[PDB]
Write an enzyme that holds these catalytic residues in place. Sequence first.
Site, mmCIF file in Angstrom:
data_model
loop_
_atom_site.group_PDB
_atom_site.id
_atom_site.type_symbol
_atom_site.label_atom_id
_atom_site.label_comp_id
_atom_site.label_asym_id
_atom_site.label_seq_id
_atom_site.Cartn_x
_atom_site.Cartn_y
_atom_site.Cartn_z
ATOM 1 N N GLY A 1 -5.380 5.511 -1.489
ATOM 2 C CA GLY A 1 -6.786 5.470 -1.138
ATOM 3 C C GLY A 1 -7.532 4.472 -2.001
ATOM 4 O O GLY A 1 -7.118 3.315 -2.138
ATOM 5 N N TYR B 1 0.748 -1.242 0.000
ATOM 6 C CA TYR B 1 0.000 0.000 0.000
ATOM 7 C C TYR B 1 0.788 1.309 0.000
ATOM 8 O O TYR B 1 1.477 1.587 0.898
ATOM 9 C CB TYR B 1 -1.027 0.171 1.142
ATOM 10 C CG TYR B 1 -1.779 1.508 1.003
ATOM 11 C CD1 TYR B 1 -2.538 1.780 -0.059
ATOM 12 C CD2 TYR B 1 -1.652 2.466 1.888
ATOM 13 C CE1 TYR B 1 -3.142 2.844 -0.185
ATOM 14 C CE2 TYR B 1 -2.280 3.584 1.782
ATOM 15 C CZ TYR B 1 -3.003 3.809 0.728
ATOM 16 O OH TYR B 1 -3.551 4.917 0.605
HETATM 17 N N1 247 Z 1 -4.233 7.839 4.389
HETATM 18 C C1 247 Z 1 -4.193 7.042 3.157
HETATM 19 C C2 247 Z 1 -4.727 7.885 1.996
HETATM 20 C C3 247 Z 1 -6.074 7.843 1.652
HETATM 21 C C4 247 Z 1 -6.539 8.580 0.568
HETATM 22 C C5 247 Z 1 -5.657 9.358 -0.172
HETATM 23 O O1 247 Z 1 -6.103 10.061 -1.249
HETATM 24 C C6 247 Z 1 -4.311 9.405 0.175
HETATM 25 C C7 247 Z 1 -3.848 8.667 1.257
HETATM 26 C C8 247 Z 1 -5.045 5.779 3.316
HETATM 27 F F1 247 Z 1 -5.367 5.444 2.330
HETATM 28 F F2 247 Z 1 -5.919 6.016 3.921
HETATM 29 C C9 247 Z 1 -4.261 4.651 3.992
HETATM 30 O O2 247 Z 1 -4.734 3.499 3.900
HETATM 31 O O3 247 Z 1 -3.199 4.962 4.577
#
Ligand code: 247
Lengths: 525, 525, 525
Positions: free
Chosen positions: C59, C52
């Site tokens: 996201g 991830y």
């Molecule tokens: N914080 C992360 C994230 C979510 C959404 C976007 O646009 C950027 C970054 C997350 F996805 F939530 C994560 O799982 O860390």
Amino acid sequence: PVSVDGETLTVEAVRRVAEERATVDVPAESIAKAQKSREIFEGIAEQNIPIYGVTTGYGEMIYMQVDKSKEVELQTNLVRSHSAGVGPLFAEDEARAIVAARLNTLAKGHSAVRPIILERLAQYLNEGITPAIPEIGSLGDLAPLSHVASTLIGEGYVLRDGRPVETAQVLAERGIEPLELRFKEGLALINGTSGMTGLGSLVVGRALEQAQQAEIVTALLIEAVRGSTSPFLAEGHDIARPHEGQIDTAANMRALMRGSGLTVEHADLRRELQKDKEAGKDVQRSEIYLQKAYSLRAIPQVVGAVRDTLYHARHKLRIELNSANDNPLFFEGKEIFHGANFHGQPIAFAMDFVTIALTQLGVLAERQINRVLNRHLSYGLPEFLVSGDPGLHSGFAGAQYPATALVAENRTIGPASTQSVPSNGDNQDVVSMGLISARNARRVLSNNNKILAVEYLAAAQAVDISGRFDGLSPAAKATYEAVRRLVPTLGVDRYMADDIELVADALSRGEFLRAIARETDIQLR
Amino acid sequence: PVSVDGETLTVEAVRRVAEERATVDVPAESIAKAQKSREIFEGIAEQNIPIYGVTTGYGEMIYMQVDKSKEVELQTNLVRSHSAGVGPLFAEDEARAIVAARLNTLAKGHSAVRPIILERLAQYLNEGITPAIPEIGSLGDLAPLSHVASTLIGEGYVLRDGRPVETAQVLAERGIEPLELRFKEGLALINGTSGMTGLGSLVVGRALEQAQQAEIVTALLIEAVRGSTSPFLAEGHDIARPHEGQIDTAANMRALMRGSGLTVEHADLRRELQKDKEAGKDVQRSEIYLQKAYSLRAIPQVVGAVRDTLYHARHKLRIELNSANDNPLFFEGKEIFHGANFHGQPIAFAMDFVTIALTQLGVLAERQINRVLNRHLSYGLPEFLVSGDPGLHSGFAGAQYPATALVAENRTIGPASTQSVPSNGDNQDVVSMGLISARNARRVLSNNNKILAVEYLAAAQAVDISGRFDGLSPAAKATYEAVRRLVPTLGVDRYMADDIELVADALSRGEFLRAIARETDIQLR
Amino acid sequence: PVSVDGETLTVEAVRRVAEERATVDVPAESIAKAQKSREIFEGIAEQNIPIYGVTTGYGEMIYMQVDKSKEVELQTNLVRSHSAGVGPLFAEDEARAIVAARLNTLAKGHSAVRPIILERLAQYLNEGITPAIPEIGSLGDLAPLSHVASTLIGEGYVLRDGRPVETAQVLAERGIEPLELRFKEGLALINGTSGMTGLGSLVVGRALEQAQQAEIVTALLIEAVRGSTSPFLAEGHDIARPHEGQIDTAANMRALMRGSGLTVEHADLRRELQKDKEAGKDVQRSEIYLQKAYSLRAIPQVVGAVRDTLYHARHKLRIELNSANDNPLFFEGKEIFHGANFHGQPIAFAMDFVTIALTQLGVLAERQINRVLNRHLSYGLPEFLVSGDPGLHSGFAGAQYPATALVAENRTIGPASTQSVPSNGDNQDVVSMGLISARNARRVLSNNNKILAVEYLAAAQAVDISGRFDGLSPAAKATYEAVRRLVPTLGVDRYMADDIELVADALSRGEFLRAIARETDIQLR
Ligand SMILES: *N[C@H](c1ccc(O)cc1)C(F)(F)C(=O)O
Ligand SMILES: *N[C@H](c1ccc(O)cc1)C(F)(F)C(=O)O
Ligand SMILES: *N[C@H](c1ccc(O)cc1)C(F)(F)C(=O)O
């Protein structure tokens, strides 16, 4: 039996007495400490020296000095003039919790009340004599406790099959001779936080079971959608972020899904995803999601935060339950303590916080419902869980609305602990409104059972539509059977209201928490 | 008889049908316009052309095309799958108002429903057949209206002595054969704002009577305390600050106190005060107040603002009552209108505003109670209106608490019209939550009657304690007698709850507005 | 130097770094841990294994698989595209607390960040390079943390004199080569609760000092109006109602008024009443109040409850500061942790409760001001503390209004932790809004200083008018002098706004807590 000793009473103990009509017993030691504090106090009041509420007027009218020759009248006029409650009556269990809280308070021994008051209160609880207590009136709990005090003196009303009946009649039909209030007894019976603390106890205890039942259906849902178990691994909480509640929720989620054949391990997910990627592409699309949405992943963090709030509330309630929230107070060898232990601010705050925490628990549960009903969001499930021809049938489409609506409704409930309004000639210039706060948390708790009811039904439905029953863990199967025992699979469209209310009632009885206990080895925190 | 013609229905008309079981009649012209819009529409649906809710799935499932051969099933599955209401049931009058609003809507002629639907709805109203409608579920009013629609097809439940009873039974016992929904009829019966608009109508109508009853007791109080009439003089409103509501309240206050021998004219006040001042002093103290506190002076400005809000709400409700809040819509010679007239935003806002305005009406009434009970604030009245030995008796001291508490409670009620939450696969991505808003205003209205009840009793008490009865104006005497007819003067302290609830019930029936009408020539705006 | 080891950072230390610019140092043991974890993680990422935010989109777009050849670009596009903050910029001290919290999070060693990132954040703090961080954007803290991340790569802006300045220039000036974000570093920097945790730390730390300063003025007020000391007696709390915060407040009040010649003991009050009474008949009036109003008697119960709430919040913040609130997380010998430790629910709840608690702290202070300004309640003090001729002069009459208005304003601030709104293709279907919760709390905190400022001025004025300076305790004389050193006694009426703002500023920097420490031997809890 539950020992009401003003020292060790617990929130769960209060619920047993209130909900399961558990017998109450004031220990000999408490009676003794009470009779002795009463003895000394009487010798003091006999000298006609100034004592609040005993030899003076009440509240702002404290400037009025009253002669001991009025003893009984002063106390009676107080109870009567303050039985000004309005609104709906508290249910039987709520009324019992309040009475139990007042008894525990007096049982501590610093109220200077005669033992028969404690004995008579314990008698009402043990003999099933429940005061009719209107819910509104308390500024944080005079009015509500005044209605209780009234019944001890053969006045006011008592609950009988949901309706109020003159206390005098019920008592005469009990062979019980009403009591005659003496020095400080009327004041001691009504000057406390027993209303908010009694009701608060029930709410918080049930709130914790709701957190557990939310974790129970969330687990089932995660299995039914084949979610990843990664978010619940101990290292991410016990090590990386040690919030008590978070650790507890993750531990419960791991135990609930233990033995599932549907959940996915992170290792398998990334391997599966790895096989799916080509070597020549710098960026390529995939239908595989290494992580699920927050509603199916941030469970430890969210429900855990709720648990923390609930743990804090229970702690405050336990201290309160076993405190001398009354005034003035008696301590052998000291001047009569004239303070404000009747001020419910600590409980007012605690319950307001519970209202907020439970609202978020509901927000989470509703988004999980949205998750399973939305085809683009659910893992291999038909739109709105329609098992037949969609469009022609809406399936659970209409069932989502009450859940969504209750979230909006819980959000219109604001904190009451900050809304004091000055009264009684500015004598009560800063109050807590604690019983409103407690009733606020109760409302959200009640609404959440309806939201959860829709989620439980949706999850069970997701199970038969997908044909994943056999893959469910032992706990998930128990939860599934519990629901099906009440409501059948949804074939063609049908009137939904009855099914939802049936499951919501079950939730309010802790029926799903029971299924887990009765059908598995699992021990939920 | 009340003519439900989808054009001229008024808020007061709705209340007559709902509260006084006034007979309803759909004019021949409306039936005709309905049968003709139905005729044409049927010829359209017969060609199996795409029409929302008639030949397609509902909401997000609109992508599903359904063949006309399903006509009856599509409509029935809809009503059943959406009868997912939860919570308490609406009272008989509330349920009647909602049904009346849906009938008026269909009676407008653009819903393309068969005349028997209108006839059957009018029949239920005229024969006393009241649907059992749960209050929660509407996102702003599918669920609630679905429960209504269910009863037309012999399903769901009907109200009987406060309890729900299977519609099939009640109908069979009526000799009434349930209906069979056809093209668009199921959708038309549930796709509107009749829940919030029906309930809103009752609330706003009663809200206006509450404003009047607040002015009635305020007048009595002003006379009992010998207040100045200066604040109500026409020039200060009609000329200096022309807000409609302000002008109306001032006019009503002048009429209510007309003929009083207790009120004071500004001229007399300043003359009296002038005689009281010495000539050698640059600054000297006086016990005379040329002006009274805001609670007994800013009445035109405050209640007037409330009236303005209520006038605006009634206007919106009247437009809504007589609108085709349904979808899709039919207009002879045009394509079927596919819009969103089912969106309750205009009523959601209106009711939220009413919630706010009524909360302030209560704030004002509670401070007036504080005014009369506080010796330092009341004009020549004993502390907490105790007629005997204060301190020994608390008088109305305990009665102020429920009023003070209800103010704090009404303040915890937040706007619902801004709390939309997306559902139905984001199809309903922006909703109004209007029925919550309506239930919010109802709650405040109900709480205000309790606050007002305490004020009415306090005022009557202020009258006998001061011995000012003979000085009261004709209207003040009527108000006083009305209260005394229900509750006697407060001599020694006594259980208060019954007295308060007795007066509050009277207020909810408009009993004090009636006393004025029946005992005086006064015509209140 | 403050040790930032991801294990032992305290709220107090956070403030030292933020407010007093204490030096920050990452211990060698932490550097070693981060280094090892980075090297192991690098080996994993090098194999193009799905992780991830490292080899996947962000996201909702986690379904997009990105090759490791795009390492730097992926992390960089993330920081840029998410630097979408809006609204005012955080102050220097607030921005430093946020940076500090992020640094401590990464220092725990589970974020798999290169040691240099820790070194650079540490360098920005130690050298005074302060990120320009917009206050709005976080759903609970991507946007604000992205603005911080930007400054590390020489983009975004840096704060200077309240104005933002392009980072590239600032670094070019200070001679620093911007960093280049490697695997996971962009995400690690922005995927946490450092915004709400950093800000929340400052707020809670100051909130505790505010509770202390509220206790300080209250003590002075009590001595100025010669209130009773019976409410603060240890047995009423330590024994009767042992809520931690309550015990502490009572203990503090006891220490503050120690050595006073103005306070009266209950024994004295009753003896004075005993003598004032002349047992001729049963009921008699007195001017003596055996007990004072709640605003001067329920101090331990109310401020105690506020303390309890602040202690809980501080505890939650301490756990959070030393947590790996980031995702995914590295745990040696284990699969990469994919959870939701970035979810701020625990702090969001915590700060919403602080908002509620502080609102009530202000409610109490405002009623205490009302107490001394109202001649009917002040106990002999002249109306509105006018020293000359009332009427001609209003004294503090006008100064009460801003305090009263602020109480109303704080009550319009509702909880944010429950206001989640789904976003990002529903991937973020449940968020915390914690930064909003923290700013809400900061606002009430700031508003309270204004309320207390008026109370400090009124207390000192009461001392002057009553000529009771010589009778003040050591602590009271110190508090009095601290005020008088900033603002003179109020003789003739005069412009009040500068006087209030001066004392409000003194309060914001804890000058009164310092006067006690510097002038007395009292150590406050
Ligand atoms: N914080 C992360 C994230 C979510 C959404 C976007 O646009 C950027 C970054 C997350 F996805 F939530 C994560 O799982 O860390
Ligand atoms: N709780 C007491 C009280 C106040 C006012 C009225 O009317 C009844 C009882 C008290 F006065 F507040 C007190 O115990 O101090
Ligand atoms: N009000 C209609 C509707 C939507 C969703 C469900 O489940 C039932 C009914 C509508 F779709 F919104 C519309 O009329 O556009």
